[PDB]
Design a protein around this nucleic acid. Sequence first.
RNA 1: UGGAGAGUUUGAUCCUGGCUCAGGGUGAACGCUGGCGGCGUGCCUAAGACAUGCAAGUCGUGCGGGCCGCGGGGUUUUACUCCGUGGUCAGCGGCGGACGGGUGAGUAACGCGUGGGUGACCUACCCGGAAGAGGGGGACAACCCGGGGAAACUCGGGCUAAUCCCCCAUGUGGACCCGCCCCUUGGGGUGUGUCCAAAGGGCUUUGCCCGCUUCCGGAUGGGCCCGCGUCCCAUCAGCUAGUUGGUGGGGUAAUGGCCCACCAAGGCGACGACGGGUAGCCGGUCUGAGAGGAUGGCCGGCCACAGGGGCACUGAGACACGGGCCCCACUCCUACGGGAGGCAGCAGUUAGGAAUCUUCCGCAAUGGGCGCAAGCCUGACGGAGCGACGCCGCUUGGAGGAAGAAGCCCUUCGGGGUGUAAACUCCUGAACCCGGGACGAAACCCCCGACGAGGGGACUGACGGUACCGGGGUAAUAGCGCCGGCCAACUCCGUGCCAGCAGCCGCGGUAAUACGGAGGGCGCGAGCGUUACCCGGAUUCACUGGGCGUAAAGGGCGUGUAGGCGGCCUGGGGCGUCCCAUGUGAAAGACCACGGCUCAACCGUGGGGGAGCGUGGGAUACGCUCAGGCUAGACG
Lengths: 99, 83, 99, 208
Amino acid sequence: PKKVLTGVVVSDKMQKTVTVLVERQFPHPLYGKVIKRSKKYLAHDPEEKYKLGDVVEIIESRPISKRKRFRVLRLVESGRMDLVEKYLIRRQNYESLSK
Amino acid sequence: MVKIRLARFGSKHNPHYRIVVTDARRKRDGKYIEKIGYYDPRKTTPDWLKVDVERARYWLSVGAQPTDTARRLLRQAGVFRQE
Amino acid sequence: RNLSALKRHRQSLKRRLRNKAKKSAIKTLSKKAIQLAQEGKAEEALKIMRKAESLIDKAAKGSTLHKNAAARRKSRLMRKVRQLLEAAGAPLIGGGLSA
Amino acid sequence: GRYIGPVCRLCRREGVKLYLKGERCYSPKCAMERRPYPPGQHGQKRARRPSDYAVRLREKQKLRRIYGISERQFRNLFEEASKKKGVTGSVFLGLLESRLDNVVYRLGFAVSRRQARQLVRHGHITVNGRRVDLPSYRVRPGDEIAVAEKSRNLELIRQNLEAMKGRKVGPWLSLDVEGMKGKFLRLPDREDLALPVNEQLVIEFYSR
RNA sequence: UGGAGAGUUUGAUCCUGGCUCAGGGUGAACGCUGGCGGCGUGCCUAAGACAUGCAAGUCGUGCGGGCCGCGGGGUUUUACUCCGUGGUCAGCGGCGGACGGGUGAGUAACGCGUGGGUGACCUACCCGGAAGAGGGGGACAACCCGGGGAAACUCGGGCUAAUCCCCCAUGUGGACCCGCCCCUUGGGGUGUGUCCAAAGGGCUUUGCCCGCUUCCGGAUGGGCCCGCGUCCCAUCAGCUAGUUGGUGGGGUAAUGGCCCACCAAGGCGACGACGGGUAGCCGGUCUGAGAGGAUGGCCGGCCACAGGGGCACUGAGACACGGGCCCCACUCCUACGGGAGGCAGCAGUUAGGAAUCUUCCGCAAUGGGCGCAAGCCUGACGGAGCGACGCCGCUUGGAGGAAGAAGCCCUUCGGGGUGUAAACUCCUGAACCCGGGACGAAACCCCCGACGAGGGGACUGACGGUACCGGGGUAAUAGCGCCGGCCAACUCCGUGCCAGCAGCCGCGGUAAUACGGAGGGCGCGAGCGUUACCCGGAUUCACUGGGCGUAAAGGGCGUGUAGGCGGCCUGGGGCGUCCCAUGUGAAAGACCACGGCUCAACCGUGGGGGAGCGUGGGAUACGCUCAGGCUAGACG
Ligand SMILES: [K+]
Ligand SMILES: [K+]
Ligand SMILES: [K+]
Ligand SMILES: [K+]
Ligand SMILES: [K+]
Ligand SMILES: [K+]
Ligand SMILES: [K+]
Ligand SMILES: [K+]
Ligand SMILES: [K+]
Ligand SMILES: [K+]
Ligand SMILES: [K+]
Ligand SMILES: [K+]
Ligand SMILES: [Mg+2]
Ligand SMILES: [Mg+2]
Ligand SMILES: [Mg+2]
Ligand SMILES: [Mg+2]
Ligand SMILES: [Mg+2]
Ligand SMILES: [Mg+2]
Ligand SMILES: [Mg+2]
Ligand SMILES: [Mg+2]
Ligand SMILES: [Mg+2]
Ligand SMILES: [Mg+2]
Ligand SMILES: [Mg+2]
Ligand SMILES: [Mg+2]
Ligand SMILES: [Mg+2]
Ligand SMILES: [Mg+2]
Ligand SMILES: [Mg+2]
Ligand SMILES: [Mg+2]
Ligand SMILES: [Mg+2]
Ligand SMILES: [Mg+2]
Ligand SMILES: [Mg+2]
Ligand SMILES: [Mg+2]
Ligand SMILES: [Mg+2]
Ligand SMILES: [Mg+2]
Ligand SMILES: [Mg+2]
Ligand SMILES: [Mg+2]
Ligand SMILES: [Mg+2]
Ligand SMILES: [Mg+2]
Ligand SMILES: [Mg+2]
Ligand SMILES: [Mg+2]
Ligand SMILES: [Mg+2]
Ligand SMILES: [Mg+2]
Ligand SMILES: [Mg+2]
Ligand SMILES: [Mg+2]
Ligand SMILES: [Mg+2]
Ligand SMILES: [Mg+2]
Ligand SMILES: [Mg+2]
Ligand SMILES: [Mg+2]
Ligand SMILES: [Mg+2]
Ligand SMILES: [Mg+2]
Ligand SMILES: [Mg+2]
Ligand SMILES: [Mg+2]
Ligand SMILES: [Mg+2]
Ligand SMILES: [Mg+2]
Ligand SMILES: [Mg+2]
Ligand SMILES: [Mg+2]
Ligand SMILES: [Mg+2]
Ligand SMILES: [Mg+2]
Ligand SMILES: [Mg+2]
Ligand SMILES: [Mg+2]
Ligand SMILES: [Mg+2]
Ligand SMILES: [Mg+2]
Ligand SMILES: [Mg+2]
Ligand SMILES: [Mg+2]
Ligand SMILES: [Mg+2]
Ligand SMILES: [Mg+2]
Ligand SMILES: [Mg+2]
Ligand SMILES: [Mg+2]
Ligand SMILES: [Mg+2]
Ligand SMILES: [Mg+2]
Ligand SMILES: [Mg+2]
Ligand SMILES: [Mg+2]
Ligand SMILES: [Mg+2]
Ligand SMILES: [Mg+2]
Ligand SMILES: [Mg+2]
Ligand SMILES: [Mg+2]
Ligand SMILES: [Mg+2]
Ligand SMILES: [Mg+2]
Ligand SMILES: [Mg+2]
Ligand SMILES: [Mg+2]
Ligand SMILES: [Mg+2]
Ligand SMILES: [Mg+2]
Ligand SMILES: [Mg+2]
Ligand SMILES: [Mg+2]
Ligand SMILES: [Mg+2]
Ligand SMILES: [Mg+2]
Ligand SMILES: [Mg+2]
Ligand SMILES: [Mg+2]
Ligand SMILES: [Mg+2]
Ligand SMILES: [Mg+2]
Ligand SMILES: [Mg+2]
Ligand SMILES: [Mg+2]
Ligand SMILES: [Mg+2]
Ligand SMILES: [Mg+2]
Ligand SMILES: [Mg+2]
Ligand SMILES: [Mg+2]
Ligand SMILES: [Mg+2]
Ligand SMILES: [Mg+2]
Ligand SMILES: [Mg+2]
Ligand SMILES: [Mg+2]
Ligand SMILES: [Mg+2]
Ligand SMILES: [Mg+2]
Ligand SMILES: [Mg+2]
Ligand SMILES: [Mg+2]
Ligand SMILES: [Mg+2]
Ligand SMILES: [Mg+2]
Ligand SMILES: [Mg+2]
Ligand SMILES: [Mg+2]
Ligand SMILES: [Mg+2]
Ligand SMILES: [Mg+2]
Ligand SMILES: [Mg+2]
Ligand SMILES: [Mg+2]
Ligand SMILES: [Mg+2]
Ligand SMILES: [Mg+2]
Ligand SMILES: [Mg+2]
Ligand SMILES: [Mg+2]
Ligand SMILES: [Mg+2]
Ligand SMILES: [Mg+2]
Ligand SMILES: [Mg+2]
Ligand SMILES: [Mg+2]
Ligand SMILES: [Mg+2]
Ligand SMILES: [Mg+2]
Ligand SMILES: [Mg+2]
Ligand SMILES: [Mg+2]
Ligand SMILES: [Mg+2]
Ligand SMILES: [Mg+2]
Ligand SMILES: [Mg+2]
Ligand SMILES: [Zn+2]
C-alpha cells in the first residue's frame, strides 16, 4: 500500500506545490521515552486548492520532480494557523544564534 | 533461464547436494529460489534422496530446466512417471 | 597477443554505422514533416509523416530503434503534426491521423 | 599427553588414596599406605590453611586425575554438561562414566583406567560388534561392549576375566564373563558412584 | 537455566576514585620447543610495481573460400574443368564475452538493512497459448590486384555467399493520433485512419527435428520511487544558482530539475543543514546474566571499483576487469615519425611489513558457455602441497617392581627428598613391512518403446594403490611457564640499591621463598609463554544501572523563546499503548532431536523458533487530540 501521512500546510509560496509538515511519535530505542519527531514533505497541489494552515492527508505518488514525491489526498480539517505559527517561531529562533 | 540443479553443501570428501531451483546465472552455492529436495551420492543413510514431487511438477510447468544429473535424480523419484 | 573477440568490436562498428544512419534519416524526415505542418501544407506534411512513421517502425524491427521508444517518437510526431495543422486546418490527405 | 609419568605421587598429593595402578593401590605398596604426606622436600612440613581457590582447584584436580583425562577434554565435557538441561554435576559424572575407557575399566576388562586406555587404543575392544579404538568414545545406553575375538586368547584378558569370576559390577552395567562382553544399561546416578569428590566444588571452580 | 572478585592512597579506618590482575576471543605475530592424522584456514601493510604460463569461448546442422593432400568424372593425349573427401587456416554470421572470479579504493549516500509502491517500467535464453512465413532485390569480408609504414598495422580498386542488409505483399495481431465506454495518474476495451512481420538448415526426406516472425501470459532477473534505521566532531552555524517550483520541450525501457529554454523566489537548517573526519553495508561473529559494547575476516546477500580521470559504441542487458576512444603518470619497442601494455583472475616475482602458501594435479564429480548431438572451453570448481594459524582426535607404553640402588639436593648428621620413579620381569604392538583395495558414477549417449513414460545396455576416478580391511611387527619425541601477595607451588648457594626482576603493590645496600643458578614443587602439555587488539570484570558514560554540602561535579542572579512536563469530571476520535489473525523475517550460522565419517572436530536431515515492519479486525484504562464543565493550582 502507498504510504499515507497527515500534516499541516506551512508554505504555499510555490506554484502547484505545498509544504506539508508531518509529525510522528515513537518510543526512544534505548531510553523508552515517547519522543516526537517531524519531517516536511513537498506535496503536489495541481489546482492550488489548499492554503496555509490546512491539515491534509498525503499519499505516496509517482515522482513529480526532485524532492517532490507526494500528492495531497484530501483535506482533513481547515486552516488552523497555530501549528504554522509554532513552525514559524521555531524557524525564526534560528536567527538569534549566529555569532 | 531458471534451472533445477544441485548445490554442494557437504564438507570435503563428504559431498551432500541440495536439489534446488535457481537462476542459472547465480553461483551454484548462492541464493536459490527454493529447495525442492536433497541427494546424498554416497548412500550413507537409508534416505539418501528425497524430492518434493508436486513442487518439481510446478517448476517444470512454469519452465525450469533441470540438469542431466538433476533430471536423472527427478526421474528416479518418479517426477515424470505418468503410468 | 590478444584474443579474437576483437571480431565483436569490428561488428559493433558496422552496426554503429547501421544505426546512426537510420536514426539520422528519421529525425530529418520528422523535422521536414513538422515544417510542412507549421506552414499549413497539410497533404505534403501527412504524406511525409506516413514515411516517417514507416521508417520508425522499420527501425524498431531491428536493434536500432527498438521497444516502445519507437512508440514515443511516433506519438510525439503525430501529436505535433495534428497540433500544428489545427493552427491552419484542412487535413487534406487523411493519412496517419485518425478522423 | 595424558600426563604420562608417576601416578601414586598423585595418590599422595591429592591426600586421598587413588587407584591409578589398579592393583598395588590395594596392596600395602601404594606408598599412600606408608607415606600419606604430599610429595616433595616440603611434604612433611606443616601445611598452611589453604585458600578457597586452593580447595576448589585441588578437588577438580582430584576428579580429573581420577579418570586420566586432559584439561582440554575435561573443560569441554564440563561446558557440554552445563549447556544441557539438568543438574550439571550428575550429568557431568554420567558423561565421564560414559567414556569407553572408563566403561572398560568398570566392566573389569582392565585393572586400571590407563590399562583400559591401552586396550582400547590397540583395537582389543569392540562396541556392538565393530572394533573401536577411541578412549573418548561415548557409550550409549544399550551398547554391548565386547572383547575382540582375536584378543580373547591373550594372557592379560585371561587373567583379568579369570579374576572377575564372582565379582559384582555396577548397577548400571551387566557382564557376561564366558562370552567376554557386557552391556551399558543406563547412565549412572550420583548415588551409584563412590567417588571421593565434591562435584559442587568443581562447578564453583569453573564458575570463576 | 542466569550475575564471584582481588591487589593498591593510611600508623590504622570508612568513603570516593583511578590503575592493575584473574576470563573469553583473534585472518595473528614473536621466543623456546615440536611426533601423526582429519576438518578448517592463510598479504590485516603499498587499491605499490609486475617477468612467465594458464585463466573465454563455441557452433561445418547459418555461409562462401584460401592452403596442403587424396579419389572419381567431361578428353585419345594435353590444356582446362566438374563432383566427392581429409586436414588445416582465418573470414562473414549467431550465441556467449554484462555470468562466473578478484578486491574495500571510493562512498555517511535510497549505498545498505527493512517494509512497501510502479496507474512510471524492461527482461536474451526458458515455459503455455493464437497465428504466419509469399515474391524480389542489394552490399561488405574471406579472396584477387596495387600502394604506404621500421613496426603496430593501414589505404585504394575488383569478385562473391548466407539464418548479412533492404523493398513489396499477406494483418492472426500489435504500435500511434483522435473519439466513446469501463477503470482511475500512462490500467483495460472499441471504431475509423495510418504504420509494422519473417530465414532458413538438417535429416532416419514429402514427415519430423533445430530454428524464424507477430502477439498475449507465466516464470526468472533487474531499473526507478517512498516510510523508518545506520559512526565521531557544534573548536563546522548558517547552506543553496540547476539552487526550489512551474510551463513546454529534449532524453530513457520508465517517473524525475536527468538535461535544456522561458517564468515564478523559492528550497534546507539546533528534530544538527552545510563542512571536516572516519568507514563498504548486512545475514552474522566475539563478548556479555541481560541490556549493551566491539567487529563485518572465512561463507551467503546487496554495493562500488578494475593504473588515475572522462566518454560513448555494440547489445535484452555494460559506461563492459582479461572490449573501444581521449587526457595524465609509469614501463617496454622505436628507423625518433610513431606504437604496445594495465594480476584488486590462478600460481609466482619484487617492494613494503612483525607477518600470510604451490610458477601443483584434474574434466572424474557439481555448476557454467556454445552445440541436434558427438564434443570443445572452464586457475568456477573438485583435490593435493606448504604453515602447530585454529578446532578436534591420537601417541611417546601397560602391569608387577625395596622401609627405598646410584647420582643429585637438603640435614638437628639420627635422617629426609627426587620415588615405583628407574634399572629390571612379563605383556600389548605407535611407527613401519607386505597383500587386497574402494564409495564418490549414472546419467548425457545407444537400443526397444513413440527421440514421451517406462525398460535395458555401454563408457567415464584427479584425489589414488589414498581411505579402509587382513597378516607381520619394534617400548618407541617432551616440552614451556610459574613458585612474595593478588595466585596453586620452598629450600640451598651465589650476589650485596651491584648484576638484575616487575601486569599492579613492590624486591636487592650480608645471611633475598621476589635477582641469578641448583634441588624440589605447581600449572598446562605438542604445545607453553610473550606482545598487540576486542569484550569482560567496569554499577568506571550507570536504559536496565551512578552521581553533584565538605571526595571530580549546581550555572553569579534573573526575565523568558523553543522544547520537555500537565489538577478534577463527562463525551467523541483511536495517534501513542494493548490484543487476535495473516504476510514478511532467504540459506548458512545459533538452539533441540536423530543420523553419516570407528569418536570428535566436520557434515546431513528434521523440528523449534524469533524482535521489527505491512495488512485486516478489535479493546479505550492510561498518554494524545477535539468539545463541554468544575475550582483545590495559578492570577486578579
Ligand atoms: K536566514
Ligand atoms: K589494607
Ligand atoms: K580492402
Ligand atoms: K485497424
Ligand atoms: K513479471
Ligand atoms: K567486458
Ligand atoms: K597381532
Ligand atoms: K529413457
Ligand atoms: K594389526
Ligand atoms: K656483579
Ligand atoms: K629465583
Ligand atoms: K532496554
Ligand atoms: Mg501533525
Ligand atoms: Mg501555492
Ligand atoms: Mg513538474
Ligand atoms: Mg544474478
Ligand atoms: Mg528412494
Ligand atoms: Mg511429468
Ligand atoms: Mg571472439
Ligand atoms: Mg564469434
Ligand atoms: Mg540532416
Ligand atoms: Mg540500444
Ligand atoms: Mg547443566
Ligand atoms: Mg545451563
Ligand atoms: Mg578499586
Ligand atoms: Mg592522603
Ligand atoms: Mg604505608
Ligand atoms: Mg591520619
Ligand atoms: Mg587477555
Ligand atoms: Mg587471554
Ligand atoms: Mg625450529
Ligand atoms: Mg590440511
Ligand atoms: Mg588451502
Ligand atoms: Mg583485520
Ligand atoms: Mg589489500
Ligand atoms: Mg584429380
Ligand atoms: Mg566420346
Ligand atoms: Mg599433348
Ligand atoms: Mg576447407
Ligand atoms: Mg572457423
Ligand atoms: Mg580481418
Ligand atoms: Mg561477481
Ligand atoms: Mg563527510
Ligand atoms: Mg555530514
Ligand atoms: Mg529502502
Ligand atoms: Mg536515509
Ligand atoms: Mg527493498
Ligand atoms: Mg529472439
Ligand atoms: Mg527476438
Ligand atoms: Mg513460445
Ligand atoms: Mg541474392
Ligand atoms: Mg546478388
Ligand atoms: Mg550481387
Ligand atoms: Mg570495394
Ligand atoms: Mg577475383
Ligand atoms: Mg534477420
Ligand atoms: Mg485487427
Ligand atoms: Mg508491409
Ligand atoms: Mg527474403
Ligand atoms: Mg521434402
Ligand atoms: Mg542450428
Ligand atoms: Mg520487483
Ligand atoms: Mg540537479
Ligand atoms: Mg518537465
Ligand atoms: Mg539503454
Ligand atoms: Mg541543500
Ligand atoms: Mg527532522
Ligand atoms: Mg575508506
Ligand atoms: Mg552466551
Ligand atoms: Mg551468545
Ligand atoms: Mg548481542
Ligand atoms: Mg558496524
Ligand atoms: Mg566480503
Ligand atoms: Mg562476503
Ligand atoms: Mg595494482
Ligand atoms: Mg579507469
Ligand atoms: Mg583508464
Ligand atoms: Mg545479445
Ligand atoms: Mg562498471
Ligand atoms: Mg572499459
Ligand atoms: Mg588482467
Ligand atoms: Mg589498443
Ligand atoms: Mg623485507
Ligand atoms: Mg592455498
Ligand atoms: Mg592441468
Ligand atoms: Mg567438468
Ligand atoms: Mg557438466
Ligand atoms: Mg579450491
Ligand atoms: Mg590436541
Ligand atoms: Mg611404571
Ligand atoms: Mg611381541
Ligand atoms: Mg555405483
Ligand atoms: Mg528410435
Ligand atoms: Mg533410463
Ligand atoms: Mg562426459
Ligand atoms: Mg587410480
Ligand atoms: Mg594393521
Ligand atoms: Mg600461595
Ligand atoms: Mg622471573
Ligand atoms: Mg600487560
Ligand atoms: Mg654471601
Ligand atoms: Mg643467600
Ligand atoms: Mg628464589
Ligand atoms: Mg626443575
Ligand atoms: Mg598462544
Ligand atoms: Mg580491559
Ligand atoms: Mg558497562
Ligand atoms: Mg554488569
Ligand atoms: Mg574510564
Ligand atoms: Mg540512570
Ligand atoms: Mg559516582
Ligand atoms: Mg566540590
Ligand atoms: Mg547558587
Ligand atoms: Mg510549547
Ligand atoms: Mg512554553
Ligand atoms: Mg491528565
Ligand atoms: Mg501537551
Ligand atoms: Mg473517553
Ligand atoms: Mg490505534
Ligand atoms: Mg534461519
Ligand atoms: Mg539447520
Ligand atoms: Mg555418531
Ligand atoms: Mg512468531
Ligand atoms: Mg491495526
Ligand atoms: Mg470505544
Ligand atoms: Mg477547558
Ligand atoms: Mg489572592
Ligand atoms: Zn596409589
